[PDB]
């Protein structure tokens, strides 16, 4: 339909071409209108005859919403156009709607206004929140303050607290401070949201409006115009009702009153009905008979003693006014079963309403599916819920399980995203089935179980959002206004009770307190009966609590180790706890280890013998471990006097003793240092005395074997570092603790090794003995039931002895099981490495004329010959003169002319029959790190391609055996080991992003592809499809320019710049001749900003937004556009990658997500170019765009802030990694450097970019770099081809 109306010039059977326009802005201008006061009844959208009309009613405002959308992005593409993603109009509606542009963009200025509440009113904030962001965005040059309150309402019903920020920000530079108040609430803080909005009202009105409520200073510990009065009241008000708080209510509305009396304002009044509450808040204290009184009055059918028509007439189109009736014919038919019961006698007509109503609630779900939004409403999912079970309730009188909402604590760790009003639903209506259970004599189903658990789920999302006023009702109903109340009134579900009854009171303020329960309570667990869950996690949250407050903590700690060798009742509580009866000594950590360190140790012990069943807990132990033995063993570098005086029967004894542990080869090194200072027990001495100041290694190592046999429950990234501790351990001392790694290393799985399998053969040359075989065996165990892993770099490295014979064991021991697979990979692997003869000759041609201005060029052309002796034979016999020629000039033309007619024949398409060919392979794919199940080659494309603009670079095609098209490319003559080492960390690095991404819509995802060396120079390169360069859109955008302007090929980027540079060189008084170095900063300056005045800024972000279909599609793409491009930003600016050029990134317009592609120029290497760049990344013009109103102090700096914060909390692993790079013998840095490189990496983890000893925070290390990437100065002076202006 939107595109008829546009291809027919707006000549609609409706009516003219302003015909059309007057009736959509009357119809929207009428919905707009009854927006504000509902008491208007629009003829044909809010009356109807029956149910079927109300679903139909909204039904046709979501079209119309729709409908209105793509006829924009028609007329945009139609005056303007796109690129790849919509196809040119004819020239003649083009040539219509370039002339008649400026009429469509009054008309839609002039109604967005109205849109806007019309969206609001249909509950499709997306549609709103983009029409608010272009209204801003148009208006450059009091309406302002109307279209910020709409879009920040909007936001907050859509849970995006970023968005909210970053308009506030935006604002500030233009009275506005009340943004962040619905900034707090979309997160789900209701009771600080509440606070602000009475401060701010207060603060705006002149009169103290404050209400009762709990503490101020315990709340915030634990987390002037009549629009905006009334807005703030209103905002109040609904806070109120989500928390279920009728008395605040109450209260709310008595001061709101007096304040409207006290004031005069005429203007302010509460948008709530309230005899809904007050039934809401009778039904819920179990007043039935009050409860049915006030039912009598609201509108709608009459409670049951005409199943079509339910609803009332007149109703508007929002859905709150149906959740609302929802909920009320769902309380009418609980009052009505409750009076009846105290079977067909008033069951007949129950049923009936029930399965209407539950009918009519799956209307939104309905209509979620309509548009591509990727999720579901939560009220109306459990609306619908709700319904059902009280269908099923009524005709089976909880007699079955059905019966019972679907609300487990399973949510827990899949449900994090949501806020605590989901769970107020559900209670509401367990409770009522939980009293009716009083008047059941039959055998019925156990509710206290499924009600206690449901109470102390929502206590727990409630407390996590700060909400102590909610926890505490919902701790105290479980259990059956002061800080010091709480102290007071707490101090299968009870561990889990207490432990939550323990966090309110630590979240209330009184840690103390809270600590003491906890060691309590993991007392009196310790000698339960299965303590698995619950001791374990008491013991875990008490020692980090202890380890946050160490500064305050750490006198006790001293005191209970004093106490241990010879107090507050946390002291004898720990005491007491320590010394319960069932590998630490005190005498080990006697050196280098501090006392009250030594108490966490012992708690993390004893956790971990408590429940060897979790990993948490090994975990724990071993980090610990591992880090106070790096720190002695560091740091370090009675019996025993005994054992040496007598095995030695004043000065002699003191150097003897001080020698046997100067500096603990080691033993020839200690047996000279002995024989030249006393003038042979020593070295029992010595080898006893080693190993007690080398024994938490043991420790750790035992620790971290036990904790990945469990593995065979945690995080990738938590497993990754225990990997990679184990492998330096037995890196750095091999012989020092190679008893244990002797058995460790033969009975570890192979699930969790599988991820530094490069690190494994990259040290397979270590100076050892065992060691080496270790390793070996390793590889070989792991070969097996997975041998897609080892396969391609064992083959590899085959075709120092050291690196041979541990290669030829492995493909020795992977071939005993398929060796028709081994064979067959080897000879392909041998075809593609003689598959990389013309092109030799003419590179060997150039290079010998190159250095002609003798012996050497004879030398290398017979060694050519020789080498060179379906396709070559055609180009033997076509060339075969060379070595005739080359002997006859040896006593020049001949090389002349043989390079002229090979550099003229080569100006593409191959084939791979003439360059063998196999099916039905059984050999795995070029990488499959993530594949359950591996895919193995069926047949090669018929045909190679090759690309220019490079070396040498050769496109192919290959089919798995589920027929899927999987492209690759070769690289020739171009080690490719450091792209494999880059792609490795790009994914330890994303795999931390795991966690965080179980709460949050955008994913944090970095695009990468996987490469792998086909030996030292050859290469094969996966191949990314569906992403799109984002220099195809300024090479359209000049096209189209091009052709407007002929009416009434394109110019390099090279060829425009320097048409601008010179004029400006010779006005300026200098000339082209002079060196870019000593160039005017001026000069280049306004030379930039008057390229940037002619390119526009909506090349991307109109892309985005064609590329889309619906205004929710449109929000997700780019939210998640937003957050790839902060995750790709602050990962490059981390790694140090450049020359971030329009062709080295593309985007998905799939999902938005952006994907670099050349990973040559890192590791800060172009700052030692022709041209030194210093901008870390590009935020070009486009860039920032693209990202909306905001720009980069929305969702944008939030985002690289939780990367960077994540980042530097696990930096341990990135630099071990790192270190592991560096010392690797296949990567070849050069093309101290591999230090250098580290230490700058460790310096920016660490915070301390560029600064003599302060360590700069996130927020402010967020703040320069993207201050630094921003300013004229920097990117004026930078390379031609980085295309600074677009
Ligand atoms: C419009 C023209 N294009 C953009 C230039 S494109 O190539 O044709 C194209 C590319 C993709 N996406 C894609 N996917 C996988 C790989 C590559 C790719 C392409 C070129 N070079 C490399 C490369 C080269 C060298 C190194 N290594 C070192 O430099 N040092 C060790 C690493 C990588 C990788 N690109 C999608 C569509 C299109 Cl059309
Ligand atoms: O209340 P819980 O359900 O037991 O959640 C806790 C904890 O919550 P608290 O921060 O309130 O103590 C953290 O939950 P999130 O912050 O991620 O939402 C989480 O990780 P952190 O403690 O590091 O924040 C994890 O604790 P841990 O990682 O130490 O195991 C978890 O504990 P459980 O997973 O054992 O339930």
């Not at 002929?1046 to 090279?1054: F, L, N, T």
Request: some cysteine; proline content about 4%; hydrophobic content about 40%.
């Amino acid at each position: 339909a939107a595109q008829f109306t546009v291809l027919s010039k707006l000549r609609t059977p409706l009516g003219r071409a302003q015909d059309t326009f007057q009736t959509i802005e009357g119809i929207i201008r009428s919905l707009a209108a009854h927006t504000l006061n509902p008491d208007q009844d629009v003829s044909q959208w809010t009356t109807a005859d029956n149910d079927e009309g109300h679903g139909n009613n909204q039904l046709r405002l979501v079209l119309l919403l729709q409908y209105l959308e793509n006829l924009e992005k028609l007329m945009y593409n139609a005056y303007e156009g796109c690129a790849n993603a919509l196809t040119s109009p004819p020239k003649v509606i083009r040539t219509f709607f370039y002339t008649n542009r400026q009429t469509c963009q009054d008309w839609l200025t002039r109604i967005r206004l109205s849109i806007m509440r019309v969206g609001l009113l249909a509950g499709q904030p997306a549609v709103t929140v983009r029409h608010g962001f272009d209204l801003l965005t148009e208006m450059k040059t009091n309406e302002l303050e109307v279209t910020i309150m709409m879009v920040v309402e909007a936001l907050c019903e859509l849970h995006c607290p970023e968005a909210i920020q970053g308009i506030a920000v935006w604002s500030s530079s233009i009275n506005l401070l009340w943004i962040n108040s619905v900034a707090q609430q979309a997160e789900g803080r209701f009771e600080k949201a509440s606070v602000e909005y009475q401060e701010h009202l207060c603060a705006m009105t002149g009169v103290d409006c404050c209400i009762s409520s709990f503490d101020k200073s315990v709340l915030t510990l634990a987390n002037s115009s009549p629009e905006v009065i009334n807005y703030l009241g209103n905002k109040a008000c609904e806070c109120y009702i989500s928390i279920a708080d009728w008395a605040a209510v109450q209260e709310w509305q008595n001061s709101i009153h007096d304040l409207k009396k006290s004031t005069s304002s005429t203007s302010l009044n509460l948008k709530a009905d309230f005899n809904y509450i007050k039934s809401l808040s009778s039904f819920e204290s179990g007043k039935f008979v009050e409860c049915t009184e006030q039912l009598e009055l609201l509108p709608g059918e009459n409670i049951n003693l005409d199943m079509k028509k339910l609803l009332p007439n007149m109703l508007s189109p929002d859905p709150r006014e149906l959740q609302k009736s929802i909920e009320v014919q769902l309380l009418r038919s609980s009052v009505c079963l409750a009076t009846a019961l105290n079977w067909q006698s008033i069951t007949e007509n129950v049923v009936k309403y029930l399965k209407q109503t539950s009918r009519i609630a799956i209307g939104p779900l309905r209509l979620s599916t309509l548009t591509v939004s990727q999720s579901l409403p939560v009220l109306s999912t459990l609306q619908l819920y709700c319904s059902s079970a009280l269908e099923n309730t009524v005709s089976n009188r909880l007699s079955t399980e059905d019966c019972l909402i679907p609300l487990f604590s399973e949510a827990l760790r899949s449900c994090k995203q949501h806020d605590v009003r989901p769970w107020m639903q559900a209670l509401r209506y367990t409770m009522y089935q939980n009293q009716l259970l009083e008047k059941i004599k039959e055998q019925t189903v156990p509710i206290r179980s499924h009600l206690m658990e449901l109470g102390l789920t929502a206590a727990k999302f409630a407390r996590k959002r700060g909400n102590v006023s909610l926890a505490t009702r919902l701790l105290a109903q479980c259990s059956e206004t002061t800080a010091q109340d709480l102290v007071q009134h707490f101090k299968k579900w009870g561990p889990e009770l207490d432990i939550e009854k323990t966090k309110l009171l630590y979240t209330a303020g009184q840690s103390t307190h809270a600590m003491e329960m906890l060691s309590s309570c993991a007392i009196s667990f310790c000698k339960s009966v299965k303590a698995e869950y619950a001791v374990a996690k008491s013991i875990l949250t008490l020692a980090k609590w202890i380890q946050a407050e160490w500064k305050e903590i750490s006198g006790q700690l001293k005191q209970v180790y004093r106490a241990q060798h010879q107090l507050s009742t946390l002291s004898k509580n720990i005491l007491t706890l320590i010394e319960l009866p069932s590998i630490e000594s005190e005498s080990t950590v006697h050196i280098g280890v501090g006392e009250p360190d030594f108490i966490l140790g012992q708690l993390y012990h004893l956790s971990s013998v408590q429940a060897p069943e979790v990993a948490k807990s090994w975990a724990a132990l071993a980090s610990w471990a591992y880090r106070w033995g790096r720190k002695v063993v560091d740091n370090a570098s009675x019996x025993x006097x005994x054992x040496x005086x007598x095995x030695x029967x004043x000065x002699x004894x003191x150097x003897x003793x001080x020698x046997x542990x100067x500096x603990x080869x080691x033993x020839x090194x200690x047996x000279x240092x002995x024989x030249x200072x006393x003038x042979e027990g020593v070295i029992k001495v010595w080898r006893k005395v080693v190993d007690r100041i080398f024994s938490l290694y043991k420790l750790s190592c035992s620790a971290y074997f036990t904790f990945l046999k469990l593995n065979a429950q945690s995080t990738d990234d938590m497993i990754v570092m225990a990997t990679l501790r184990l492998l330096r351990l037995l890196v750095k001392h091999a012989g020092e603790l190679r008893q244990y790694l002797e058995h460790g290393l033969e009975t570890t799985p192979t699930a969790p090794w599988r991820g530094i399998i490069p690190q494994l053969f990259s040290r397979l040359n270590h100076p050892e003995v065992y060691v080496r075989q270790s390793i070996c065996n390793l590889l070989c165990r792991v070969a097996q039931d997975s041998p897609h892993l080892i396969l391609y770099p064992a083959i590899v490295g085959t075709i120092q002895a050291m690196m041979q014979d541990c290669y030829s064991k492995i493909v020795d021991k992977l071939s005993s099981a398929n060796p028709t697979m081994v064979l067959q990979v080897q000879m392909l692997v041998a075809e593609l490495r003689r598959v990389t003869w013309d092109e030799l000759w003419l590179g060997v041609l150039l290079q010998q004329h190159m250095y002609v201005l003798x012996x050497x060029x004879x030398x290398x052309x017979x060694x050519x010959x020789x080498x060179x002796x379906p396709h070559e034979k055609w180009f033997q016999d076509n060339y075969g003169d060379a070595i005739e020629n080359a002997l006859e000039k040896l006593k020049x033309x001949x090389x002349x002319x043989x390079x002229x007619x090979x550099x003229x024949x080569x100006x593409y398409i191959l084939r791979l029959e003439e360059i063998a060919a196999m099916t039905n392979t059984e050999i795995a794919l070029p990488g499959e790190v993530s594949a359950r199940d591996t895919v193995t080659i069926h047949s090669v494309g018929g045909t190679i391609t090759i690309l220019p603009t490079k070396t040498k670079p050769k496109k192919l095609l290959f089919l798995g055996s589920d027929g899927k098209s999987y492209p690759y490319l070769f690289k020739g003559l171009e080690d490719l080991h450091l792209d494999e080492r880059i792609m490795q960390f790009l994914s330890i690095v994303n795999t931390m992003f795991a966690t965080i991404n179980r709460q949050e819509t955008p994913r944090f995802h970095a695009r990468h592809y996987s490469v792998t060396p086909l030996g030292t120079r050859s290469g094969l390169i996966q191949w990314v499809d569906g992403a799109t360069p984002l220099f195809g859109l300024y090479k359209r955008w000049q096209q189209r320019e091009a052709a407007l302007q002929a009416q009434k090929i394109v110019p390099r980027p090279s060829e425009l710049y320097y048409s601008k540079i010179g004029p400006a060189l010779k006005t300026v008084g200098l000339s082209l001749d002079v060196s870019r170095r000593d160039w005017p900063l001026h000069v280049m300056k306004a030379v930039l900003e008057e390229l940037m005045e002619a390119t526009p800024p909506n090349l991307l972000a109109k892309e985005l937004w064609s590329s889309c279909t619906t205004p929710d599609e449109w929000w997700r793409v780019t939210q998640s556009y937003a957050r790839s491009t902060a995750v790709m930003s602050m990962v490059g600016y981390i790694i140090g990658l450049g020359d971030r050029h329009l062709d080295n990134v593309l985007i998905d317009m799939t999902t938005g997500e952006v994907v670099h592609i050349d990973y040559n120029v890192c590791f800060e290497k172009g700052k030692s170019l022709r041209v030194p760049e210093k901008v870390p990344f590009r935020m070009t013009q486009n860039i920032e765009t693209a990202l909306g109103v905001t720009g980069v102090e929305g969702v944008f700096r939030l985002s690289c802030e939780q990367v960077l914060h994540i980042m530097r909390r696990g930096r341990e692993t990135l630099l071990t990694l790192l270190e592991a790079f560096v010392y690797d013998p296949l990567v070849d840095w050069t093309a101290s450097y591999a230090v250098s490189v580290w230490k700058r990496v460790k310096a920016k983890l660490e915070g301390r970019d560029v600064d003599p000893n302060r360590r700069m925070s996130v927020a402010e290390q967020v703040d320069y770099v993207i201050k630094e990437a921003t300013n004229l100065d920097n990117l004026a002076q930078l390379y031609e081809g980085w295309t600074a202006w677009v």
